[PDB]
Amino acid sequence: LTNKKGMTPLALAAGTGKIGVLAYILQREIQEPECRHLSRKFTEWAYGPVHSSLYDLSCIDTCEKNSVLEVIA
Amino acid sequence: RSIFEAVAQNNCQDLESLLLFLQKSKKHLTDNEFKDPETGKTCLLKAMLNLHDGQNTTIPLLLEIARQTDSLKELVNASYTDSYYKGQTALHIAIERRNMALVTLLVENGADVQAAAHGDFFKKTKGRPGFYFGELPLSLAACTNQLGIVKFLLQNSWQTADISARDSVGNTVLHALVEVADNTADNTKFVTSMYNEILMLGAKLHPTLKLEELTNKKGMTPLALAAGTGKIGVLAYILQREIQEPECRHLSRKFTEWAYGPVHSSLYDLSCIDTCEKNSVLEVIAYSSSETPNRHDMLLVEPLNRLLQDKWDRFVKRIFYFNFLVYCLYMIIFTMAAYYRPVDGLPPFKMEKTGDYFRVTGEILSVLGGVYFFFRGIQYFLQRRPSMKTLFVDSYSEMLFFLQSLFMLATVVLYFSHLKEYVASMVFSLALGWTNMLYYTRGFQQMGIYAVMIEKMILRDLCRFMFVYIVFLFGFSTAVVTLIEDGKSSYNSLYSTCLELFKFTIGMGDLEFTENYDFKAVFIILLLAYVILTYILLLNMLIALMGETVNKIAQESKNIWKLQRAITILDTEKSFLKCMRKAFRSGKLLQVGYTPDGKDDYRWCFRVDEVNWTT
Numbered sequence: 001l002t003n004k005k006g007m008t009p010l011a012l013a014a015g016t017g018k019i020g021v022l023a024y025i026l027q028r029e030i031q032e033p034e035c036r037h038l039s040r041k042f043t044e045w046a047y048g049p050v051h052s053s054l055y056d057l058s059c060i061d062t063c064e065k066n067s068v069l070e071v072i073a
Numbered sequence: 074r075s076i077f078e079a080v081a082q083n084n085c086q087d088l089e090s091l092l093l094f095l096q097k098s099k100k101h102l103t104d105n106e107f108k109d110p111e112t113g114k115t116c117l118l119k120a121m122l123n124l125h126d127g128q129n130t131t132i133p134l135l136l137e138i139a140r141q142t143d144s145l146k147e148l149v150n151a152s153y154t155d156s157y158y159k160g161q162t163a164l165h166i167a168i169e170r171r172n173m174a175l176v177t178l179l180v181e182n183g184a185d186v187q188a189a190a191h192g193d194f195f196k197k198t199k200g201r202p203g204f205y206f207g208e209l210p211l212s213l214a215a216c217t218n219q220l221g222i223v224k225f226l227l228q229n230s231w232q233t234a235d236i237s238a239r240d241s242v243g244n245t246v247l248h249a250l251v252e253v254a255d256n257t258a259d260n261t262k263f264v265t266s267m268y269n270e271i272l273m274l275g276a277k278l279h280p281t282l283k284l285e286e287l288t289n290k291k292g293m294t295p296l297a298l299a300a301g302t303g304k305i306g307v308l309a310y311i312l313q314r315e316i317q318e319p320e321c322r323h324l325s326r327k328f329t330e331w332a333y334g335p336v337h338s339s340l341y342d343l344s345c346i347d348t349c350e351k352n353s354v355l356e357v358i359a360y361s362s363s364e365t366p367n368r369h370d371m372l373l374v375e376p377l378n379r380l381l382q383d384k385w386d387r388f389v390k391r392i393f394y395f396n397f398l399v400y401c402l403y404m405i406i407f408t409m410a411a412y413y414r415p416v417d418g419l420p421p422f423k424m425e426k427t428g429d430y431f432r433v434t435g436e437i438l439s440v441l442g443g444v445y446f447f448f449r450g451i452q453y454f455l456q457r458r459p460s461m462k463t464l465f466v467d468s469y470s471e472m473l474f475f476l477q478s479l480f481m482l483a484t485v486v487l488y489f490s491h492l493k494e495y496v497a498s499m500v501f502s503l504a505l506g507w508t509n510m511l512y513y514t515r516g517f518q519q520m521g522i523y524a525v526m527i528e529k530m531i532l533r534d535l536c537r538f539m540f541v542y543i544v545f546l547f548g549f550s551t552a553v554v555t556l557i558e559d560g561k562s563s564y565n566s567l568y569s570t571c572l573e574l575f576k577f578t579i580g581m582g583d584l585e586f587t588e589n590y591d592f593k594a595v596f597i598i599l600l601l602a603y604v605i606l607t608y609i610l611l612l613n614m615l616i617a618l619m620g621e622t623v624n625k626i627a628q629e630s631k632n633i634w635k636l637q638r639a640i641t642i643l644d645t646e647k648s649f650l651k652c653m654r655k656a657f658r659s660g661k662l663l664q665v666g667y668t669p670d671g672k673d674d675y676r677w678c679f680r681v682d683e684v685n686w687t688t
């Protein structure tokens with residue numbers, strides 16, 4: 001959801017300079033399977049002691065508008 | 074086909090009808106109709122992966138279903154087929170999922186405990202995802218910290234795994250255990266713990282087997298492998314490994330002699346340590362390429378530092394001093410020969426006075442020393458056979474002595490070709506010669522650390538400062554030359570003006586050196602900008618950065634100096650003539666105790682006397 005600045009909560013946290021909120025949001029991992037789709041950091045396979053992880057790049061990469069990278073830069 | 078789908082939900086209903094269907098068709102679970110065409114995925118494997126709470130109920134039922142088809146011994150030992158996982162076995166999946174009960178269950182049904190999990194995924198390879206563990210269920214249990222499972226796999230009833238079984242690369246369990254460590258806290262903790270555990274287990278099971286001396290395909294014992302790859306924690310544990318159990322006491326590596334009151338005499342075992350052996354830990358660490366991390370730190374562990382210091386204080390200090398003195402005389406003679414060169418005609422020059430005879434003798438000795446250093450550099454480039462990066466990034470002194478020899482040989486070539494230019498070459502060889510005496514600062518602690526810091530500055534700070542300074546100097550020199558009209562010392566050349574603006578840096582610059590322009594204001598503005606940027610800003614900033622660098626490399630310098638002295642000691646011991654090199658083996662031959670079979674355990678041990686005040 002966007003405010004009247006068209007400025008999403010992640011985008012707002014990036015632009016305003018709130019770093020703790022940004023660190024939480026970008027590595028948000030949720031254990032509950034009923035809402036696990038919310039999270040943004042997905043383990044992909046955990047053979048032994050190694051883990052592959054996927055970080056969602058939606059609204060972070062420059063391909064969108066008001067991306068986090070562009071707003072920080 | 075959808076049996077995997079049924080098992081994923083842990084539904085046992087469909088398998089009851091599947092058993093009857095199989096009895097109707099008289100088929101087996103291992104038939105190709107039930108294996109994935111590209112992976113060879115079997116029903117037992119799919120059941121093992123899609124576990125719930127660590128226990129899936131369909132696994133035993135599938136076991137009986139296979140058994141009535143007479144396929145228990147074949148279904149369980151089924152493996153992947155795709156090259157990525159080629160060799161993976163359901164026992165491996167049991168191990169990595171950490172299911173004791175399922176491991177016992179599989180080993181009951183005739184599971185092989187020697188299945189080489191040797192796919193592409195299970196090989197140590199940089200850049201791609203993977204996990205190297207030794208290609209065996211024993212090794213996989215070891216490298217994943219299941220002490221119970223390894224104890225079981227070594228001491229079960231159905232089938233016990235082989236402790237000394239090697240994989241494709243030839244690693245035992247100990248080699249893989251070493252190769253999995255990565256020098257952190259908990260990793261080192263558990264690696265050392267289970268290394269000890271497997272040593273006791275091997276001592277119990279095979280008391281006559283020296284497990285720790287098995288070598289992989291490169292012929293490296295686990296100790297030497299730990300030294301080579303840079304696993305400092307494993308090395309520290311192994312070299313000081315002390316075991317108090319009387320049955321495993323012979324496995325200890327750091328004993329005691331007597332403990333009168335508060336003072337003890339601890340013996341350290343020098344086997345595979347002292348350079349008299351092959352691939353000894355000292356040689357392995359000293360000659361290791363710079364890629365291996367912790368290379369400087371690994372000399373800090375007992376008894377390595379004490380051993381090297383003993384060698385130095387006992388028979389290498391004198392040899393190093395003699396080498397220093399000989400090089401000093403060589404440079405003195407070289408300098409006196411070059412200084413007194415005739416300054417008339419073309420070379421070679423005639424031998425007229427007695428002074429000419431002396432000078433010819435000096436020239437002969439100088440060329441002889443240059444040839445000697447040339448050949449020594451060639452021999453170093455052969456024996457080490459270092460890579461180009463290691464050649465230009467690590468030696469830095471074999472390179473410099475070699476370069477001096479190259480200049481000497483170019484000098485003699487030019488000298489006998491009737492060229493004056495020989496002088497040029499010679500003076501370079503002369504300058505380098507003297508500035509190579511910093512090498513011998515290795516032999517003294519304070520000066521050695523000082524020279525190490527000099528190196529560190531030249532490489533860290535001076536290079537960056539020089540790049541920026543060159544950019545500024547060239548830019549402003551071009552600007553000034555452009556501004557300056559006809560020079561008629563005619564600073565209308567780029568060289569002379571670069572020199573004039575360089576004079577500023579050495580505190581000797583002139584702000585009014587030309588008077589031969591059209592815009593005095595522009596000239597003054599340019600010179601003031603240059604002075605402010607380089608003299609005031611850049612040079613003082615360089616001083617500040619050297620201060621910070623000094624602050625940050627206080628201990629690295631000492632470590633690097635100690636490693637340099639280590640290399641010097643090793644080379645000196647190797648090169649020294651045989652009439653005494655054997656006469657100064659380090660340590661003493663002492664009867665530590667008794668072998669597990671029972672016999673005198675004579676070892677070459679190094680004695681250190683220490684004191685403790687908790688008694």
Ligand SMILES: CCCC[N@@+]1(CCCCCN2CCCC[C@H]2C(=O)Nc2c(C)cccc2C)CCCC[C@H]1C(=O)Nc1c(C)cccc1C
Pocket residue numbers: 466467468469470471473504505508509511512524525527528531633636637640
């Ligand atoms: C460049 C530093 C080398 C450090 N180095 C060699 C020391 C030799 C003394 C030479 N001087 C030192 C001080 C001034 C520069 C230089 C010099 O002549 N400049 C120069 C030139 C190039 C032309 C004309 C005129 C001059 C003055 C220190 C001792 C060991 C060898 C090596 C070392 O550090 N090697 C090592 C490593 C890296 C990592 C790990 C282990 C090791 C052994």
